[PDB]
Design a protein around this nucleic acid. Structure first.
Ligand SMILES: [Ca+2]
Ligand SMILES: [Ca+2]
Ligand SMILES: [Ca+2]
Ligand SMILES: [Ca+2]
Ligand SMILES: [Ca+2]
Ligand SMILES: [Cl-]
Ligand SMILES: [K+]
Ligand SMILES: [K+]
Length: 55
DNA sequence: CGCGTACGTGCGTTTAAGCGGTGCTAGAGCTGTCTACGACCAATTGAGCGGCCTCGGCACCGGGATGCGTTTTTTTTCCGCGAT
């Protein structure tokens, strides 16, 4: 009875991939642990700066 | 190279940094405890990849328009000399 999958991006209201960003943080040798809001925050900042250059 | 004065020098006056010290207490830093949060795992599936087709944006062309650099002949300007 498994719930339909909503991407973490859609929950954060982002177009940039939260889930990918989390996975690059975890595998990029930055810290032993990555908190749940970190990729959400970082994807958001990457999205903002992308928008601003694109505008 | 020649002209004007901005900076270096020195000296006499004035300022406040440095020093050694005491006193007070904010907050750095440490300890132990509890628990929210992240890692890990296994199953499940949809986001995003590689591959493939299409047709309009863009590169490239020639032609014509126009912006502008250059020179020579033309009108205005700013002097510039003394002689007053
Ligand atoms: Ca944004
Ligand atoms: Ca914007
Ligand atoms: Ca593609
Ligand atoms: Ca082409
Ligand atoms: Ca041409
Ligand atoms: Cl976090
Ligand atoms: K202290
Ligand atoms: K905690």
């Amino acid at each position: 009875a498994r719930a339909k999958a909503k991407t973490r991006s859609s929950r954060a209201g982002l177009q940039f991939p939260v889930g990918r960003v989390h996975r690059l943080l975890r595998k990029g040798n930055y810290s032993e642990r990555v908190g749940a809001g970190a990729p959400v925050y970082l994807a958001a900042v990457l999205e903002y700066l992308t928008a601003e250059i694109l505008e």
